[PDB]
Structures are given as C-alpha cells and as structure tokens.
Amino acid sequence: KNTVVRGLENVEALEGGEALFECQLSQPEVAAHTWLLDDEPVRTSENAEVVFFENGLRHLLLLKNLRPQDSCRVTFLAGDMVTSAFLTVR
Known about the structure:
The chain is an all-beta fold. It has a single domain (1-90), classed as Immunoglobulin-like (Sandwich), CATH 2.60.40.10. It has no helices and nine strands. Strands 2-9-8-4-5 form a five-stranded mixed β-sheet, with no helix packed on it. A hairpin with a 2-residue loop joins strand 4 and strand 5. It comes from Homo sapiens (Human). It is found in: Cytoplasm, Myofibril, Sarcomere, M line; Cytoplasm, Myofibril, Sarcomere, Z line; Cell membrane, Sarcolemma; Nucleus.
C-alpha cells in the first residue's frame, strides 16, 4: 500500500515571488493525484504549474506571482493518502 514518504512542508514566500511544494511517496502514482488550494483544485496555469518526477515518486506544485490574498492551505491528494501544509505570503 502506498504512503507519504515526505509530506508537504509549509512555505513562506512574499508576493510575487513564487512558492514551491513537494511531496514524495513510497510507490509511484501517476494518475490519481490532485493539488488543492484551500479546497479548490489547482487549475493549471502560467501562474500555477504541476509536475512530477521519477514516474510519480515525486510531486511538485509551483505557484507564481503571489498576493498575500493567496495565503492558504495546500493539499495534495493521491488515491487515499493526503498531506498538507500552509502557504504564507509576504
């Protein structure tokens, strides 16, 4: 069964500016993941980028040009696991 090997850690960044979250897993997951800001899923956009490496062992979220307004709760979700952290801006 697969587990989080390296949780989201909180991130401090100042508007804007950019922030970057990462998250590693025991087993590789490529299809069932989604990132969330507060509770809204990330919409890929020039201001938000989503990728993974090593065939799904590592997951990354990059958010660009932040406004403190943007301070929130980042969640990564893959199948059933779940890891979270805080994004503080400025």
